[PDB]
Amino acid sequence: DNLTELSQQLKQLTAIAALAEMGEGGQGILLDYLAKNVPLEKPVLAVGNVYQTLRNLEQETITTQLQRNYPTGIFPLQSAQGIDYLPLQEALGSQDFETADEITRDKLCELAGPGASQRQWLYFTEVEKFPALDLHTINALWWLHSNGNFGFSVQRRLWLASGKEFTKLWPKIGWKSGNVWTRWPKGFTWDLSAPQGHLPLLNQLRGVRVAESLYRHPVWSQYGW
């Protein structure tokens, strides 16, 4: 039957979208898919898309069931430093990308330690020493909850495709428009209409050293990003 065919299609995005618009039957199939695939080991975009598509329906019973079954979301919230990533997950699950961006900024300082937490900005050497595990968790959350549109991994791949020229990267990801830097916070696009790689933001006020160290970090290759 048609719904079963759609289940097999889990192109993944098209089936998921169709199933979600097909009432209780379609939504049941999506819920069963999560039950069979969560918690994720590796990030799988289809699973992120099923969860987020269901969240986006904004229906009490679905949302309540998701919170009950998956109170911490679909991806293990692991940290080499014991950091709490649930508020980041919650902001992303609500598609509140502006809050998610603020939390990510705060969490990176927390990850770097007392000094960064106090000054509220990073040195490139702190970024180089970040544990891979935390960067993987943070990136996975952004990626899984944005249909792969957001994440440092996404920016890194665009940077690689720009010959590592940051001046070519900024317009691609919407951080500069010609000679004009995008102005924080109102100039940015806090939704999925934003260009690929738009979030999370890396303030350029202190130069590109932090961003470059982040994109060169071993985590991306290590975890297959």
Spatial CB neighbours of 84, under 8 Å, sequence gap ≥ 6: 77
Angstrom distances, CA of residue 207 to CA of 15, 21, 211, 212: 43, 46, 8, 10
For the CB of residue 138, give the shortest distance to ligand DE9 in the complex, in Å.
15
205 near ligand DE9, judged by CB under 6 A = yes
Q: Does 204 bind ligand DE9 (CB under 6 A)?
A: yes
CA distances to 35, 99, 104 from 185, in Å = 38, 11, 15
Q: Which is nearer to ligand DE9, 130 or 175 (CB)?
A: 175
The residue among 99 and 204 lying less far from ligand DE9, judged by its C-beta, is 204
| Shortest CB 64 distance to ligand DE9, Å | 34
Nearest residue to 197 via CA among 164, 165, 175: 175
Selected binder of ligand DE9 within 181, 191, 221, 222 (CB under 6 A): 181
Cα angle for residues 131, 212, 181 (degrees, 5° grid) = 125
Closest alpha carbon to 209 in 123, 148, 138, 86: 123
- 119 touches ligand DE9 (CB under 6 A): no
Query: In the complex, what is the shortest distance from the CB of residue 98 to ligand DE9, in angstroms, rounded to a whole number?
Result: 10
Asked if 33 is part of the footprint of ligand DE9 (rule: CB under 6 A), the reply reads: no
149-176 burial: b if 16+ Cβ within 10 Å, else e: bbbbbbbbbbbeebeeebeebbebbbbb
Q: Site for ligand DE9 (CB under 6 A): which residue of 33, 175, 220, 225?
A: 175
Note whether 184 binds ligand DE9 by CB under 6 A.
Answer: yes
Question: Binding residues for ligand DE9, how many (CB under 6 A)?
Answer: 9
* Cα separation, 176 vs 195, whole angstroms: 12
Minimum distance from residue 148 beta carbon to ligand DE9 (Å): 20
The minimum distance between CB 187 and ligand DE9, in angstroms, equals: 9
Question: Looking only at residues 120 through 139 of this chain, which bind ligand DE9 when binding is defined by CB under 6 A?
Answer: 121
Which residues contact ligand DE9 by CB under 6 A?
121, 175, 181, 184, 201-205
